[PDB]
A paper describes a structure:
Several natural systems exhibit ‘facilitated dissociation’, in which an effector (E) can bind to a target–host (TH) complex to form an excited ternary complex (THE)20–26 from which the target dissociates quickly. We set out to design protein systems that undergo facilitated dissociation. We use a switchable target binder (host) and a flexible effector that can rapidly bind to and switch the target–host complex to induce a large steric clash with the target, forming a strained excited ternary complex. We show here that by explicitly considering excited intermediate states when designing coupled protein systems, a broad range of facilitated dissociation systems can be designed.
Residue numbers in the entry:
A (entry chain B): 3 to 26
B (entry chain A): 0 to 257
Write the structure that this text describes.
């Protein structure tokens, strides 16, 4: 479960960063 | 490995570029947390966040990117606490599905403060606050929930005793319940002030005029005044409430304007 939870953290954080990168 | 030294160089460029002390502190701990992490996926996220932060000049977005790097590096890999990974994911999902930058700031701040506290009562309070915020799309209600969760986690980080933290918890329930009834943001800010007063074991006097609601807090010392000011000012910024601050000796005077 820790592996699957850690994967979702990395995936969600990568999408949140590109979200902040596009919007100004 | 090689990313850790690059992260330190990227964090150093941000410190010299900007003058915001909160950005410089976030860049500092992002480099510290990354150096103590062996997970490559954690290092690539915080380096990706630092690189995009250098591509921007807006201090509000640089702080948000830095908060993502701090939260992921705090608990975003295996060999981390399973409950800390759950809270980290709740804040990241809530921030990704929200438009208001104050919701993104509040969700990341509340999560980071809960993980650093290592207090089980603070961990469950922030966890349940994040899930309650995800369950609704009322951005005004979400901002009040995050403000209460962050101020409560600060009390634990500051070292509030179990007895005083429990009294502060009753105000967290009261604030959230009052926000769901549509209470004015001024009264919600007054509840944050009351939460921090009971959480630190001091007293407060409220002089209500209807126009100038003034709160006088006595018995606070240096570290306690910083924690109180950080929690109240953070709540006011998330709720859009204008607040006037004046401190003198061991007394802090807070005026909550509509």
């Amino acid at each position: 479960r820790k592996k699957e939870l850690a994967k979702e953290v990395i995936e969600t954080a990568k999408k949140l960063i590109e979200k902040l990168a596009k919007e100004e | 490995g090689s990313m850790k030294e690059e992260i330190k160089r990227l964090a150093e460029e941000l410190k010299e570029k900007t003058k915001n002390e909160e950005i410089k502190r976030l860049a500092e701990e992002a480099a510290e947390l990354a150096e103590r992490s062996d997970d490559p996926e954690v290092l690539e996220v915080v380096k990706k966040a630092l690189e995009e932060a250098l591509k921007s000049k807006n201090e509000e977005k640089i702080e948000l990117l830095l908060l993502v790097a701090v939260l992921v590096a705090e608990a975003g890999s295996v060999d981390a606490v399973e409950e800390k990974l759950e809270i980290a994911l709740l804040a990241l999902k809530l921030a990704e599905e929200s438009k208001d930058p104050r919701i993104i700031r509040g969700a990341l701040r509340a999560a980071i403060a809960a993980l650093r506290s290592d207090d089980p009562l603070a961990l469950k309070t922030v966890k349940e606050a994040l899930e309650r915020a995800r369950a609704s799309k009322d951005e005004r209600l979400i901002r009040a929930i995050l403000a209460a969760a962050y101020a409560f986690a600060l009390l634990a980080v500051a070292g509030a005793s179990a007895e005083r933290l429990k009294e502060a918890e009753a105000i967290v329930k009261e604030l959230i319940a009052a926000a769901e009834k549509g209470a004015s943001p001024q009264e919600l800010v007054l509840l944050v002030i009351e939460m921090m007063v009971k959480g630190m074991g001091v007293t407060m006097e409220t002089h209500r005029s209807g126009n100038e609601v003034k709160v006088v807090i006595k018995g606070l010392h240096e570290s306690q005044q910083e924690v109180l000011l950080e929690a109240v000012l953070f709540a006011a910024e998330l709720m859009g409430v204008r607040v006037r601050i004046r401190f003198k000796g061991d007394t802090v005077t807070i005026v909550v304007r509509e």
